[PDB]
């Protein structure tokens, strides 16, 4: 089946395009490391599909946590990235929630309604 990764960006932070790109990259690398360490097979299946990544929007932090819980309840991998205002991942505000890599059908149940970034 199809496998993918969704990157959810927090809209109320009003991050610029470059910052979003960086935060999404942090989430993708984090998720890759996680999935590699927990389900090598699903990782391979995601790579076979061309390791697709799609960026969507969430209005605020409350939404990110709700998505996190839902994804967890479906057995999906989750990656939460915090930024402090620099180039490094560090305690601060939650910027992006990475969901997956995981089965596309499950992922869509969690984020399918979110608007594309």
UniProtKB/Swiss-Prot annotation:
GO terms for biological process: apoptotic process; negative regulation of anoikis; negative regulation of gene expression; positive regulation of anoikis. Its main location: mitochondrion. It is found in: Mitochondrion outer membrane. GO terms for molecular function: peptidyl-tRNA hydrolase activity. GO terms for cellular component: cytosol; membrane; mitochondrial outer membrane; mitochondrion. It catalyses: an N-acyl-L-alpha-aminoacyl-tRNA + H2O = an N-acyl-L-amino acid + a tRNA + H(+). There is a cross-link at residues 14, 19, 33, 44, 53, 109, 115 (Glycyl lysine isopeptide (Lys-Gly) (interchain with G-Cter in ubiquitin)). Belongs to the PTH2 family. It is linked to Neurologic, endocrine, and pancreatic disease, multisystem, infantile-onset 1: A progressive multisystem disease characterized by a variety of neurologic, endocrine, and, in some patients, pancreatic features. Variable clinical symptoms include global developmental delay, hypotonia, hearing loss, ataxia, hyporeflexia, facial dysmorphism, hypothyroidism, and pancreatic insufficiency. Monomer. This is Peptidyl-tRNA hydrolase 2, mitochondrial. It comes from Homo sapiens. The gene is PTRH2.
């Amino acid at each position: 089946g199809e496998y993918k990764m969704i990157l959810v960006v927090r809209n109320d932070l009003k991050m610029g395009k470059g910052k979003v790109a960086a935060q999404c990259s942090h989430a993708a690398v984090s998720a890759y490391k996680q999935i590699q360490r927990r389900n090598p097979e699903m990782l391979k299946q995601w790579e076979y599909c061309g390791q697709p990544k799609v960026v969507v929007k969430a209005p605020d932090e409350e939404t990110l946590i709700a998505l996190l819980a839902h994804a967890k309840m479906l057995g999906l991998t989750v990656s939460l990235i915090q930024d402090a205002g620099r180039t490094q991942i560090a305690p601060g505000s939650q910027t992006v929630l990475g969901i997956g890599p995981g089965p596309a059908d499950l992922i869509d149940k969690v984020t399918g309604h979110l608007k594309l970034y």
